Design an enzyme around this catalytic site. Sequence first.
Site, PDB file in Angstrom:
ATOM      1  N   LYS A   1     -29.942  28.364  31.992  1.00  0.00           N
ATOM      2  CA  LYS A   1     -29.986  28.801  33.383  1.00  0.00           C
ATOM      3  C   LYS A   1     -30.132  30.313  33.427  1.00  0.00           C
ATOM      4  O   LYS A   1     -29.233  31.003  32.967  1.00  0.00           O
ATOM      5  CB  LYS A   1     -28.728  28.369  34.138  1.00  0.00           C
ATOM      6  CG  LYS A   1     -28.679  28.724  35.617  1.00  0.00           C
ATOM      7  CD  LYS A   1     -27.361  28.220  36.215  1.00  0.00           C
ATOM      8  CE  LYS A   1     -27.220  28.365  37.701  1.00  0.00           C
ATOM      9  NZ  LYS A   1     -26.101  27.523  38.187  1.00  0.00           N
TER      10      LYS A   1
ATOM     11  N   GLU B   1     -24.040  22.524  28.863  1.00  0.00           N
ATOM     12  CA  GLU B   1     -24.124  21.114  28.439  1.00  0.00           C
ATOM     13  C   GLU B   1     -25.241  20.435  29.214  1.00  0.00           C
ATOM     14  O   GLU B   1     -25.444  20.715  30.399  1.00  0.00           O
ATOM     15  CB  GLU B   1     -22.693  20.599  28.647  1.00  0.00           C
ATOM     16  CG  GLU B   1     -22.383  19.132  28.624  1.00  0.00           C
ATOM     17  CD  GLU B   1     -20.852  19.080  28.572  1.00  0.00           C
ATOM     18  OE1 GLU B   1     -20.194  19.405  29.623  1.00  0.00           O
ATOM     19  OE2 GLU B   1     -20.313  18.911  27.436  1.00  0.00           O
TER      20      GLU B   1
ATOM     21  N   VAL C   1     -33.704  26.817  35.851  1.00  0.00           N
ATOM     22  CA  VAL C   1     -32.996  26.049  34.806  1.00  0.00           C
ATOM     23  C   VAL C   1     -34.034  25.366  33.935  1.00  0.00           C
ATOM     24  O   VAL C   1     -34.830  24.594  34.486  1.00  0.00           O
ATOM     25  CB  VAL C   1     -32.047  25.010  35.410  1.00  0.00           C
ATOM     26  CG1 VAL C   1     -31.322  24.250  34.313  1.00  0.00           C
ATOM     27  CG2 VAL C   1     -31.060  25.666  36.352  1.00  0.00           C
TER      28      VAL C   1
ATOM     29  N   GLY D   1     -34.250  27.552  42.301  1.00  0.00           N
ATOM     30  CA  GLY D   1     -33.894  27.734  43.723  1.00  0.00           C
ATOM     31  C   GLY D   1     -32.817  28.778  43.783  1.00  0.00           C
ATOM     32  O   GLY D   1     -32.808  29.633  42.870  1.00  0.00           O
ATOM     33  N   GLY D   2     -31.901  28.695  44.744  1.00  0.00           N
ATOM     34  CA  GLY D   2     -30.839  29.717  44.914  1.00  0.00           C
ATOM     35  C   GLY D   2     -29.934  29.856  43.680  1.00  0.00           C
ATOM     36  O   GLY D   2     -29.305  30.913  43.543  1.00  0.00           O
ATOM     37  N   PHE D   3     -29.874  28.839  42.810  1.00  0.00           N
ATOM     38  CA  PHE D   3     -29.128  28.835  41.518  1.00  0.00           C
ATOM     39  C   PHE D   3     -29.896  29.609  40.414  1.00  0.00           C
ATOM     40  O   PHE D   3     -29.310  29.840  39.338  1.00  0.00           O
ATOM     41  CB  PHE D   3     -28.818  27.397  41.072  1.00  0.00           C
ATOM     42  CG  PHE D   3     -29.992  26.442  41.108  1.00  0.00           C
ATOM     43  CD1 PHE D   3     -30.863  26.334  40.024  1.00  0.00           C
ATOM     44  CD2 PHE D   3     -30.250  25.672  42.241  1.00  0.00           C
ATOM     45  CE1 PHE D   3     -31.966  25.484  40.082  1.00  0.00           C
ATOM     46  CE2 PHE D   3     -31.365  24.845  42.307  1.00  0.00           C
ATOM     47  CZ  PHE D   3     -32.210  24.739  41.219  1.00  0.00           C
TER      48      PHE D   3
ATOM     49  N   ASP E   1     -19.274  24.236  46.999  1.00  0.00           N
ATOM     50  CA  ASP E   1     -20.593  23.642  47.353  1.00  0.00           C
ATOM     51  C   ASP E   1     -20.655  22.207  46.831  1.00  0.00           C
ATOM     52  O   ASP E   1     -21.671  21.827  46.184  1.00  0.00           O
ATOM     53  CB  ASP E   1     -21.675  24.551  46.794  1.00  0.00           C
ATOM     54  CG  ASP E   1     -23.047  24.343  47.386  1.00  0.00           C
ATOM     55  OD1 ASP E   1     -23.128  23.762  48.463  1.00  0.00           O
ATOM     56  OD2 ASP E   1     -24.014  24.693  46.672  1.00  0.00           O
TER      57      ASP E   1
ATOM     58  N   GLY F   1     -35.954  22.901  37.198  1.00  0.00           N
ATOM     59  CA  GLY F   1     -36.024  23.261  38.620  1.00  0.00           C
ATOM     60  C   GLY F   1     -35.640  24.710  38.794  1.00  0.00           C
ATOM     61  O   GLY F   1     -35.233  25.357  37.782  1.00  0.00           O
TER      62      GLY F   1
HETATM   63  C1  OWB Z   1     -27.802  24.350  38.492  1.00  0.00           C
HETATM   64  C2  OWB Z   1     -27.259  23.872  37.167  1.00  0.00           C
HETATM   65  O1  OWB Z   1     -26.201  24.337  36.672  1.00  0.00           O
HETATM   66  N1  OWB Z   1     -28.028  22.905  36.568  1.00  0.00           N
HETATM   67  C3  OWB Z   1     -27.808  22.083  35.411  1.00  0.00           C
HETATM   68  C4  OWB Z   1     -26.720  22.211  34.561  1.00  0.00           C
HETATM   69  C5  OWB Z   1     -26.616  21.396  33.447  1.00  0.00           C
HETATM   70  C6  OWB Z   1     -27.567  20.431  33.178  1.00  0.00           C
HETATM   71  C7  OWB Z   1     -28.662  20.307  34.024  1.00  0.00           C
HETATM   72  O2  OWB Z   1     -29.601  19.315  33.631  1.00  0.00           O
HETATM   73  C8  OWB Z   1     -30.461  18.694  34.500  1.00  0.00           C
HETATM   74  C9  OWB Z   1     -30.556  19.158  35.808  1.00  0.00           C
HETATM   75  C10 OWB Z   1     -31.542  18.583  36.603  1.00  0.00           C
HETATM   76  C11 OWB Z   1     -31.706  19.242  37.966  1.00  0.00           C
HETATM   77  C12 OWB Z   1     -31.729  20.784  37.882  1.00  0.00           C
HETATM   78  C13 OWB Z   1     -31.799  21.427  39.264  1.00  0.00           C
HETATM   79  C14 OWB Z   1     -30.680  20.912  40.145  1.00  0.00           C
HETATM   80  N2  OWB Z   1     -30.803  19.455  40.256  1.00  0.00           N
HETATM   81  C15 OWB Z   1     -30.649  18.763  38.971  1.00  0.00           C
HETATM   82  N3  OWB Z   1     -32.323  17.578  36.158  1.00  0.00           N
HETATM   83  C16 OWB Z   1     -32.131  17.187  34.876  1.00  0.00           C
HETATM   84  C17 OWB Z   1     -33.037  16.124  34.343  1.00  0.00           C
HETATM   85  C18 OWB Z   1     -33.681  16.271  33.110  1.00  0.00           C
HETATM   86  C19 OWB Z   1     -34.546  15.280  32.677  1.00  0.00           C
HETATM   87  N4  OWB Z   1     -34.790  14.157  33.365  1.00  0.00           N
HETATM   88  C20 OWB Z   1     -34.155  14.013  34.538  1.00  0.00           C
HETATM   89  C21 OWB Z   1     -33.290  14.957  35.063  1.00  0.00           C
HETATM   90  N5  OWB Z   1     -31.221  17.709  34.017  1.00  0.00           N
HETATM   91  C22 OWB Z   1     -28.790  21.127  35.134  1.00  0.00           C
END
Ligand code: OWB
EC number: 2.7.11.1
Length: 277
Positions: free
Chosen positions: A39, A93, A24, A19-21, A139, A17
Amino acid sequence: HHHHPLESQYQVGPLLGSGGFGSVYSGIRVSDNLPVAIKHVEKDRISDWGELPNGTRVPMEVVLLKKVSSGFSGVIRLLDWFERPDSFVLILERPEPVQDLFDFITERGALQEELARSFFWQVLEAVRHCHNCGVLHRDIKDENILIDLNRGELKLIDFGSGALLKDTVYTDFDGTRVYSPPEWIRYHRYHGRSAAVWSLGILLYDMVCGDIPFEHDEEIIRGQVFFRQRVSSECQHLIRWCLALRPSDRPTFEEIQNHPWMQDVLLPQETAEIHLH
Ligand SMILES: CC(=O)Nc1cccc(Oc2cc([C@@H]3CCCNC3)nc(-c3ccncc3)n2)c1
């Protein structure tokens, strides 16, 4: 329920994804196939800078992550970072499999109180860890919480709006408005712990009702909570205490964790067996 040498040591996967972060990506550390999140933050979109002990100039986000990333906790750990000409790159992580709490609530609707208790308890432990390390997240919201679906463990992400914890007034805020307290809306002034507790009340309502209680500044300021779903008396009492209009009328973290609604929490593993598997 609405939203509000590097290329050597890591194999980059899909974009997760942006956005403002920043942006990633899914990644893997080549040395041991550790799942990571990669990120990217653009230098000209960083309003907030700090320095590490050794005293290099970095995003505050990096200062705050390093302060909280020591030992085990319910906070996503910073494994490494890189500076590029126009950006910083953070290596975080990545639990697997994972789902953000916002998506989990989209799919399941309002959570059973047992499950909301387990999740809310873990968030309070994570926030205590941050404050104990001298970090204010600023936040806290479902979009900034990851669920380790195998272990039933929650992890706080996105320290991009955070600050060092202090005992004096904050007059800056760039977190999520609908989780921001009435003293911010009315006066552009808040203290860290009591503003955190307000956001926790919004989060708990979100969990047990499947959406946030307030959309407009007027509703935040009026602070009248209407329950759209069947919620226990004890849960409503805790939420309304967290959402006290006067900051000094809000509970401390100790008072939340000693509240009768919070007694007899499930362990994370039992949470995953009953609710997630
Ligand atoms: C901003 C930050 O520090 N992010 C972060 C930090 C560590 C791990 C991470 O891992 C993520 C994040 C998301 C999203 C990313 C955008 C915000 N919302 C959650 N989704 C999945 C995922 C992967 C695979 N299948 C389902 C889901 N993994 C995202």
